[PDB]
Design a protein around this ligand. Structure first.
Ligand SMILES: *[C@@H]1O[C@H](CO[C@@H]2O[C@@H](C)[C@@H](O)[C@@H](O)[C@@H]2O)[C@@H](O[C@@H]2O[C@H](CO)[C@@H](O)[C@H](O)[C@H]2NC(C)=O)[C@H](O)[C@H]1NC(C)=O
Ligand SMILES: *[C@@H]1O[C@H](CO[C@@H]2O[C@@H](C)[C@@H](O)[C@@H](O)[C@@H]2O)[C@@H](O)[C@H](O)[C@H]1NC(C)=O
Lengths: 592, 21, 17, 108, 21, 17
């Protein structure tokens, strides 16, 4: 109870005095105070207006164009400290174009902890020459006090009143001249002995406690301070906040629960109206410092395992990605706060480019929509996407929506990828190359489709395999649909592969830069019914020696009569070209 | 900015109105 | 045209709050 | 433009509006292969409208083209997502009023 | 242009003067 | 602000040729 009343937030009071009464119970303003643009106010409006409870402002005080106000002596009689934690253009105190202000009269103002004073263009303003600012600010060098009545030869500043010129206000030197120091005709400037430093003193000249700032009711007692030099707790001024408290806004001690209440879910307002408070080095602060991220269950900043997660808050809660350039805008993002719309119709090396820019996204808080993305064969470029929350949904309550994607054959590889969808429904329409099995797998994993695709079906087997150091010769089963008539084509795929990790729907072949070497194999000639296995084959040439090749065959995509089938694909076989004979390794070794 | 709209510039008697608080 | 202190004045002519 | 309704009017989904800066006449759909990448046509996907009952259901799908050069002829046409396509209409953005050509001429 | 300076825009009472013939 | 026929008029207020 050093500040008995409320702690209020910063305020911005304009036009009318109505909202000003919101300050009536504040002991401390935790923020700034701006009072401005009151053109219709007159002295009578301020005669019976007072906020004697206000002791301190943590940021700055600004007064601009407030008509009728002639002094601040009745408005803020007890304002003792302006901390200047945040400033107005390096200023902690701003008095500007206060037409009618005759004196400041802030007779209890002892300390301005940080920042400077700007008092400018106050045409009636006097009692400025009588203030010794060196008692209030450590450096007066940056003060800007000009264009006031005081500049001319019209101020009749008078401090003496009781006896007049016989033992009244303290006097201090400017350069060589002693000047009596006062705020008004009835109020002296308080000056303490030098041993008191900034702590203040009683009327009898006895020093306040070293934890006090500016003034106290009793000497050398940290429970009797008007304001604190360091931190405030339970009517006491302390050097540091003791356990279990945290340092808050560089002036008070708060408990975990307070910090927790601030943090909690300021639903929308990310852009100036939330922060989400965290704990770091016994401080409750707006956000984690660089190199730290927030451990969620206890609000505690912990150092990042590698680079820090990066939350990208989208404008209006959405973003449409229709190019490599727009995707780049999300490079480095690990969390999307909002929803994504994918609309990619063309380009080059898209799977790699999209994976580079979007491959780190682990979570999307809203929905994901893929629509008219003609160029996409897979959504695997979203390499790390594990969660879609569905906190926002597409009209019809959809969290995942896929519409009119003409080449989409894969969502994610459900043998490896896990994706969770907390809320909302799925929508799939006009995805002609996407089998319903992939959609059904997604439903399982997550908690007009495929009509132009025949989905794996039959198995072609290799009847023959032959290696050369530079070549591979293969044969495989002939394919014959129900009505054996008009068989036209095979397709052989081969890539240089390491071990195991090879798939058909790999690194989006799409249109351009390809992940697979491809051969069109002409359909064979049957040559009657008895012994018609004139096994289609191929001679691979242009291969590196001692190299493993992922290889598989497919039968060209046939719109069949009645129950439609394209046919068969072979399994992925790995074939390693020949290398050196042991004998031949030996030779080259054994003979220079 | 308002400075940039009417000082280092010239602002329409309506542009001027709009955000009158 | 419009400037300095006059902007404040110009706006009040218009505002009339 | 006219709303499109297939036989079973159910599940209507999409329109597509094409516009390019054009001189005269010589404009076609299958022009300079849009293929995949560098395009010859500026394209807009227009969401299907909402019918709002049977008597007066022409809540005519439309579009606001912005980012056009003034006094410029535009080849424009609409298509229904894979029914009907509109014909190629040329539309010339507004230019200067005669009055306003005069002014700029008559006063330095 | 003068049209562009004061019609599709706003021109300063001096910008307006300058080229008075 | 300034426009149409008024521009001609506005300029004459200023010109006074
Ligand atoms: C294939 O996987 C390798 C490594 O993963 C393991 O080994 C494979 C042979 C296979 O058995 C996998 O299932 C295993 O998980 C990946 O290799 C990376 O290659 C780059 C090349 O410069 C290298 O810098 C990385 O360190 C390698 N990563 C690891 C973990 O070793 C490769 O990305 C996988 N490729 C595909 C298409 O899945
Ligand atoms: C001063 O207090 C009066 C009583 O109400 C209190 O203030 C409100 C805002 C809440 O904090 C409530 O719990 C309190 O009981 C009010 O009439 C007056 O508005 C208050 N002024 C301020 C500073 O808010």
């Amino acid at each position: 109870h050093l500040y008995p009343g409320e702690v209020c937030p910063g305020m911005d009071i304009r036009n009318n005095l109505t909202r000003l009464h919101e300050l009536e119970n504040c002991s401390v303003i935790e923020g700034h105070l701006q009072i401005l643009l009151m053109f219709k106010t007159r002295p009578e409006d301020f005669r019976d207006l007072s906020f004697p409870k206000l002791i301190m402002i943590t940021d700055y005080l600004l007064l601009f164009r407030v008509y009728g106000l002639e002094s601040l002596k009745d408005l803020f009689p007890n304002l003792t400290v302006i901390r200047g934690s945040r400033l107005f253009f390096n200023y902690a105190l701003v008095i500007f174009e206060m037409v009618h202000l005759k004196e400041l009269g802030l007779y209890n103002l002892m300390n301005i902890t940080r920042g400077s004073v700007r008092i400018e263009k106050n045409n009636e303003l006097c009692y400025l020459a009588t203030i010794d600012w060196s008692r209030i600010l450590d450096s007066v060098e940056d003060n800007h006090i000009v264009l006031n009545k005081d500049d001319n030869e019209e101020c009749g500043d008078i401090c003496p009143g009781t006896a007049k010129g016989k033992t009244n206000c303290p006097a201090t030197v400017i350069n060589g001249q002693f000047v009596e120091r006062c705020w008004t005709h009835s109020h002296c400037q308080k000056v303490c002995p030098t041993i008191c430093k900034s702590h203040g003193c009683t009327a009898e000249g006895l020093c306040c406690h070293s934890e006090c700032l500016g003034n106290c009711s009793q000497p050398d007692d940290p429970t009797k301070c008007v304001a604190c030099r360091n931190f405030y707790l339970d009517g006491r001024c302390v050097e540091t906040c003791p356990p279990p408290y945290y340092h808050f806004q560089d002036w008070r001690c708060v408990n975990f629960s307070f910090c927790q209440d601030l943090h909690h879910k300021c639903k929308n307002s990310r852009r100036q109206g939330c922060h989400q408070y965290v704990i770091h080095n016994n401080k409750c602060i707006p956000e984690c410092p660089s190199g730290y991220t927030m451990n969620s269950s206890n609000l505690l900043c912990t150092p990042c395992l590698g680079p820090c997660p990066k939350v990208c808050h989208l404008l209006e809660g959405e973003k449409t990605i229709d190019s490599v350039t727009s995707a780049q805008e999300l490079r480095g993002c690990t969390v999307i706060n909002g929803s994504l719309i994918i609309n990619i119709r063309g380009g080059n090396n898209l799977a790699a480019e999209l994976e580079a820019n979007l491959g780190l996204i682990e979570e999307i808080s809203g929905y994901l929509k893929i629509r008219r993305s003609y160029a996409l064969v897979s959504l695997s470029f979203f390499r790390k996407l594990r969660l879609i929350r569905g906190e926002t949904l597409e009209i019809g309550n959809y969290s995942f929506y896929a519409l009119d994607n003409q080449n989409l054959r894969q969502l994610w590889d459900w043998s490896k990828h896990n994706l969770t969808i907390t809320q909302g429904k799925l929508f799939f329409h006009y995805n002609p190359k996407l089998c319903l099995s992939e959609i059904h797998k997604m439903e399982e994993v997550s908690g007009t489709n495929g009509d132009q695709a025949s989905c794996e079906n039959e198995l072609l087997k290799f009847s023959y395999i032959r290696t050369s150091f530079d070549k591979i010769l293969l044969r495989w089963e002939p394919y014959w649909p129900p009505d054996f008539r008009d068989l036209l084509g095979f397709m052989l795929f081969y890539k240089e592969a390491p071990y195991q990790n090879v798939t058909e729907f790999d690194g989006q072949d799409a249109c351009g830069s390809n992940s697979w070497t491809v051969v069109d194999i002409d359909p064979p000639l049957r040559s009657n019914d008895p012994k018609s296995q004139n096994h289609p084959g191929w001679l691979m040439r242009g291969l590196k020696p001692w190299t493993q090749y992922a290889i598989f065959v497919k039968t060209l995509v046939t719109f069949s009569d009645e129950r439609r089938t394209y046919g068969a694909k072979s399994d992925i076989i790995y074939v390693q070209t020949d290398a050196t004979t042991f004998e031949d390794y030996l030779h080259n070794v054994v003979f220079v | 900015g308002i400075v940039e709209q009417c000082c280092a510039s010239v602002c329409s008697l309506y542009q001027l109105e709009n955000y009158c608080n | 045209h419009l400037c300095g202190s006059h902007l404040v004045e110009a706006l009040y002519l218009v505002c009339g709050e």
